[PDB]
Amino acid sequence: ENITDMAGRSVVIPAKVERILLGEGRLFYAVSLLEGQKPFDRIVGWQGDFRKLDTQTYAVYKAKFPQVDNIPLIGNTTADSISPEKVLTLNPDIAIFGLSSELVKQLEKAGVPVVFVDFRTSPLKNTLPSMRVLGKVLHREQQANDYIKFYEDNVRKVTEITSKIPADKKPSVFIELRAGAMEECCGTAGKGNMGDFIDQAGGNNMAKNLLPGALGTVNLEKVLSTNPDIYIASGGKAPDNNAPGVSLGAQVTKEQAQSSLQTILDRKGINTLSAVKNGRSYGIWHNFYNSPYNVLAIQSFAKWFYPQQFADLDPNNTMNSLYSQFLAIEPTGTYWVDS
Ligand SMILES: O=C(O)CN(CC(=O)O)CC(=O)O
Ligand SMILES: [Fe+3]
What we know:
Shape: globular
CATH superfamily of the largest domain: Nitrogenase molybdenum iron protein domain
Strand content: 5-15%
Keywords: Ruckerbactin, metal binding protein
Largest sheet: 5 strands, mixed
Assembly: monomeric
PDB class: metal binding protein
Radius of gyration: 20 Å
CATH architecture of the largest domain: 3-Layer(aba) Sandwich
Bound molecules: nitrilotriacetic acid, fe (iii) ion
CATH topology of the largest domain: Rossmann fold
Number of domains: 2
Entry title: Structure of YIUA from Yersinia ruckeri with Iron and nitrilotriacetic acid
Oligomer: monomer
Helix content: 25-40%
Name: Periplasmic substrate-binding transport protein
Structural class: alpha/beta
Number of helices: 12
């Protein structure tokens, strides 16, 4: 009847859930795992981050489910169709938020149950507990628990190997989040976020000691001085976009991915790293930084870090299984890339 969310708040599970508000649109990644062939049927509103910041995934859904464009966008901008203060008109049974608000207050003041999850700041600790909570409060425990089993299995395949690797034998690693996005450079993950995936994949994240939190910045000069064994760039850029950025996602091929990475690797400063010269330079889909599908990032990283140990591991296969079992769309495009 009650469950504890990732804020440690006790929440009363509603007996009927037909109407789900997503405080962050990209929480749809999690919800989608639960809704089988009816992904949108219970979504009554969402913030626009999925539609606006994941145009590629949105577009694939829109192809098969045009109704996605009718889902109200909650926010205060001209791109939004319903302001926080009026979200009660949507009659949500429950509202889902990330840990990372006037909206939350408005919903709590209306007696709407609010559940906090987290795939962003501490994914290693919080991914699976988040999914468990979601299975319970959205009445999809079978789907949650099967996903939990699938994720555990697929993570173990890595960690049963990477946990036995001595630290001195581990590659040093630097991930540049949204490489080529802002003008200043080297937004990264430290004690959390994609850091967790580096850790689980047997890497040594050079930003871990440089940052107090999960997310932060390391100046290029420090990246260049440290000169890690491995360089990773995250991005989710449209393959039709000339702005610098790694093009990855549902609508990107390998060749477009490689090409856009190459532009990122050719940047002044970055092009002097040994990792770039050695070709130990890689691209990862940015939205794995806030998604329960992050098992695929862990598997990708492991393959880059220990290519021999993970010769037979194929994240594209892992992804295929995830889609087959849980999702109403087919897997397409490119979510990781090598030089
Ligand atoms: O999440 C957002 O609203 C915007 N992002 C970029 C992105 O996620 O594409 C910055 C950040 O989360 O630091
Ligand atoms: Fe972001």
